[PDB]
Design a protein around this nucleic acid. Sequence first.
RNA 1: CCCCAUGAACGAGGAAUUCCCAGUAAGUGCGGGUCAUAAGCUUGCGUUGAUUAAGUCCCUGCCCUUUGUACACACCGCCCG
RNA 2: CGCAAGACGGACCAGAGCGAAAGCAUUUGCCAAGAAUGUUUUCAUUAAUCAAGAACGAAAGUCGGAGGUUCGAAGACGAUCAGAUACCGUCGUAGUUCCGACCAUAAACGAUGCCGACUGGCGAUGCGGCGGCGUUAUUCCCAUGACCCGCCGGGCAGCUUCCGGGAAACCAAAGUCUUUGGGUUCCGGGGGGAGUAUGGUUGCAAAGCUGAAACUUAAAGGAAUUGACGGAAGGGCACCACC
Lengths: 215, 136, 107, 64, 126
Amino acid sequence: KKVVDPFSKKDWYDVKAPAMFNIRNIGKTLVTRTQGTKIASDGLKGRVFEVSLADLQNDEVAFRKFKLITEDVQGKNCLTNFHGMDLTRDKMCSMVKKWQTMIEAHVDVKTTDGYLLHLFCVGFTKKCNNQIRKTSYAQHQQVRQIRKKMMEIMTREVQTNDLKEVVNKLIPDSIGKDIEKACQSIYPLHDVFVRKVKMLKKPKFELGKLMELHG
Amino acid sequence: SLGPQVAEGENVFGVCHIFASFNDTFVHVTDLSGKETICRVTGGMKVKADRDESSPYAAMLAAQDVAQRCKELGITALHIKLRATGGNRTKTPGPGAQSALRALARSGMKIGRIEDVTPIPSDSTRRKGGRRGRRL
Amino acid sequence: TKKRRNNGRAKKGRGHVQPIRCTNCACCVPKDKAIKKFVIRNIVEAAAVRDISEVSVFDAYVLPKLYVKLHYCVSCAIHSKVVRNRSREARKDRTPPPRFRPAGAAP
Amino acid sequence: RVQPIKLARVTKVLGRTGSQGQCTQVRVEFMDDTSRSIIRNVKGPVREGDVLTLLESEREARRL
Amino acid sequence: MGRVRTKTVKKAARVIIEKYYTRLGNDFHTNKRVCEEIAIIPSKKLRNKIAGYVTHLMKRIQRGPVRGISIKLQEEERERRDNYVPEVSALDQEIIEVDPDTKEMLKLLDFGSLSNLQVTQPTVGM
RNA sequence: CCCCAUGAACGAGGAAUUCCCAGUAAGUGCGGGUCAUAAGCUUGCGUUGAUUAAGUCCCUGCCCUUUGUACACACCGCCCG
RNA sequence: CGCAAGACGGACCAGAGCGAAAGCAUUUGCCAAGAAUGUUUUCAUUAAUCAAGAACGAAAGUCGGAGGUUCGAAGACGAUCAGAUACCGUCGUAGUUCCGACCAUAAACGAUGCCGACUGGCGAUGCGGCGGCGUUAUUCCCAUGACCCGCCGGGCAGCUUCCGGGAAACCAAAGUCUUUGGGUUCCGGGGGGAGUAUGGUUGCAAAGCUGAAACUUAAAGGAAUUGACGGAAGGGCACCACC
């Protein structure tokens, strides 16, 4: 029986990104008018938006995505925090080519602020120009030592430094380059990225750091 | 109706989300969180025949009925996640998925990024109905 | 009388390999046997990009791809002319080919 | 969602399809704006320089 | 199409042209008279069909040598053309530029020569 | 054959299906064959004269490669309980 | 958006690897094991191949639990058909998965015993060793490392070849077979009756091994060749075909 079309009731908030990113005004989102029987901030607070790092930086960051999760609300403002980085589908699919070895290593590590992260890396062998084998695999020995190197760096590079510096780090892709330096002594490699980061455990609350990062 | 804000420049943003399978085509904008909907409508509802559930022309009609209320409630713009049946299912796009995208862009909403989100599985759960294949 | 010296498709040094499921019959065929065709295509397609480029914000952007590696069992890949009977002689040619790389102005 | 009517002029006659062989391929200069040019399928007998009245004005076929 | 000249005709055309080039012409009307003089052809329609195809040939020959026809005059023309030779092209200009090893090719061949070195880099297969 | 009278169904044809591209389809009369007599026939001829593809291999039919075949009185053929 | 269960290890992944074969792709650690190579180490004939005996042995099935996510041998359903107990849709079973026992069979095909020698060209690739006043990658030079080129073993193979083989298809082994003789082991003697009867044996069971006859019958069969013909592929052609 005709009733309550719902937008004509809904309220708007402006999604705000952390400081390390560049521009910070992500877009807008709608919730229901708060009623005592309700907390529009409730239906608002653990929401996560996934935005492209390119929109976030402005660029070459076509591939790469960041998951931004709403951590608190202040009048039409909602302050989000790093929740993850993935790659998309197209980019990842495009690296994976036959005749080359695909190498993956991932490590789970606690940051300086508590956060527990599982953080993945990836690489592919490279034929080097005057090669005339068509393929370019690596040996099992190689990959085992390469993986150890990737893993050592990723734990080394996340142990020291908080969620923010990992972020500040993943933007100019300094890990990538570091891997490249530690591995060329062992075997070629084309591509190379920390390709995903997964938030496993969150520390408790603290608006302090959140604001430090926003505001 | 309504609008997040006057904005003679940037556009209020939502998520477009199209599932194209064969035998139908879902179009779907939601709030960039996802938790809250906004105007759905499928390629089914706008024709009758079951056989024609999935045809691009129906798909157009659906993306048109959708874009309407999209620009009628507040979304000025939308980022799209196209999908297939996925799972162990086919893994190829259904026919009126393209048609829906051409229909909303043409409609005159705004576009932003794209990824595919069909669920591809580090394979298993045996695919349906048996070893000798659908024979037909 | 034995037809292909390769029998089905290349094994030689095995006796076994896991089987895949046809992407059409949902059949079942060893992975050594089975026609495989990669499939990379733009999210948008032919006509769209122009409305897709105009309607979008962003200054260019610049289109994702969907990537899908297909598998067919013999009967499907024949049926649908993925592959076509070749004379007692032509069968021996593994190679591959066409003349330009059909990407817009082909058949 | 939509309506308009489009005038288009035949640039080049492609060949014939339909298994029956009764639909003629055509290339159309877009009449109101020449900076457009598309492939459409025909019922009748068509020859260069005469004009189509396009409903759909995207679409752009192929076989069938 | 429907008028595709058959061998009995096409042959006669190659034939006459081979033994008749300087006699024959550009024009249907005259060869037709010529076929009466230089050949014995049984019906008038055949002789016409012959005169006609051989003229189509003469029209073509007189615009570029045609795939299988030779006449004394055309042989003479090719002969004269097939003389050419300039200031001459190698020179090659003072000093050959070698790829070395080709330098070591002369060096260990007991042979003086002009010189230049630019031969390094390997070198992929495919 | 005529003259009168009696003055039927049939008011557009389902499943199907023939034939056809220019003086062609179709209307329309004539003459020849049969013939003593007997034209609703066949077999031409002029007259009046369009609509419509202008192509293609879908169905059908037949021959073109390649291919499969336990067929070869050849698919209107020769396989299991 | 989170979470639980059970399943499975995609893309990368190949005429590529290993393993006696059956078979075997997530990380990491432990445990022993296996080939190749290198090797102026050790023994001095230790050795080749095999009745009997024995180890392993995909799948289904069977015994008892765990477990059943997924899909699903049976059944019940909806359609289709002249009939439909089917294919096709749906619901859905034992089962799939895992543990401890059975069972001993798969076009378990490379349909090709195993071992040794000899007879023919080229380029790949896994791997080991060896060589280069070759490339690129670094520091102050390096030790590095990956490559290019060559050489040699032993892998799985490929390619081209009037050696030669074979009925041919094919085959560098199916060669070195009437010029018939390197070692050893196994099975077959027209086709059906038949892996059947019967006794023995193994099995909880389902079944497995060994394995006849009476009778029946003049071809069974192989290979190549060619048509005919196809609801196989590129094919065409004609208003006796369509449009």
